[PDB]
Design a protein around this ligand. Structure first.
Ligand SMILES: *[B]([O])([O])C1=C(/[C]=[C]/C([O])=O)C2=[C][C]=[C][C]=C2S1
Length: 263
């Protein structure tokens, strides 16, 4: 079956020239609204949520883990490191690295989270431990952003990421303290105002993590608190056929608007 909302999303996709993936979970009734929900998309920086969450899980059995210093060396700097570059030849704690990765999309910070987990497979292993059989992280920053069409590396599906984001932020995949910390970090994101949030009524609140890569890959995953109703989880993935395609955050905003108007 094709709903009115799915038809609107297909029309948006057609006009955009790219490939759009959407998954909504409305926690009022647990109903789902999917568009290419089982197709794979490159996650790009949206994978930072899984890495931060995996470190939060580790911290449940180590009260001091988040205060643990990690050395930042000149050689650790990658392609986008607005926070880590300030701390080169010094240290950042795992909490500081998590906050930098989530709220500023700092790529050096992400690489330190990955290293703490023993490599990209450590992030995948955490995903499996919380019931996500779809997520895969194969590479570090910045190569996890190559976003080559048909490449399964560093991909997930909208359905899988929406389910996982729900379990992490609203469910019991993490301890209560850790879930709260994750929600706090997402709510303080600095990079999200042009993406999912731009399509939502201004009265609503949300936390999100954006992503961008090659092939004009433009992503956002959000937990949303709409005025006067139960929270939503929304993931919007978008990727384009040319390697050097421009970002299209407006497409994500449009998808979010269609979803909101369909409630
Ligand atoms: B992530 O791996 O998508 C990367 C981001 C940030 C994504 C976002 O949505 O802010 C950047 C930003 C600048 C240069 C490289 C990367 S990788």
């Amino acid at each position: 079956q094709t709903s009115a909302v799915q038809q609107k999303l297909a029309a948006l996709e057609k006009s955009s020239g790219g490939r759009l993936g959407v998954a909504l979970i409305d926690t009022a009734d647990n109903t789902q609204v999917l568009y290419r929900g089982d197709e794979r998309f490159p996650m790009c920086s949206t994978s930072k949520v899984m890495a931060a969450a995996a470190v939060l899980k580790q911290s449940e059995t180590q009260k001091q883990l988040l205060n643990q210093p990690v050395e930042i060396k000149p050689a650790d700097l990658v392609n986008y490191n607005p926070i880590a570059e300030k701390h080169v030849n010094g240290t950042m704690t795992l909490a500081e690295l998590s906050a930098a990765a989530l709220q500023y999309s700092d790529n050096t910070a992400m690489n330190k989270l990955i290293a703490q987990l023993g490599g990209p497979g450590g992030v995948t292993a955490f995903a499996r431990a919380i019931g996500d059989e779809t997520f895969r992280l194969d590479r570090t920053e910045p190569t996890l952003n190559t976003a080559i069409p048909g490449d399964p590396r560093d991909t997930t599906t909208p359905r899988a990421m929406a389910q996982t984001l729900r379990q992490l932020t609203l469910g019991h995949a993490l301890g209560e303290t850790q879930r709260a910390q994750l929600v706090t970090w997402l709510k303080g994101n600095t990079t999200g105002a042009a993406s999912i949030r731009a399509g939502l009524p201004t009265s609503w609140t949300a936390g999100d993590k954006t992503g961008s890569g090659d092939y004009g890959t433009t992503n956002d995953i959000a937990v949303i608190w709409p005025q006067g109703r139960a929270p939503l989880v929304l993931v919007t993935y978008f990727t384009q056929p040319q390697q050097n395609a421009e970002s299209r955050r407006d497409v994500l905003a449009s998808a979010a608007r269609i979803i909101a108007e369909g409630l």
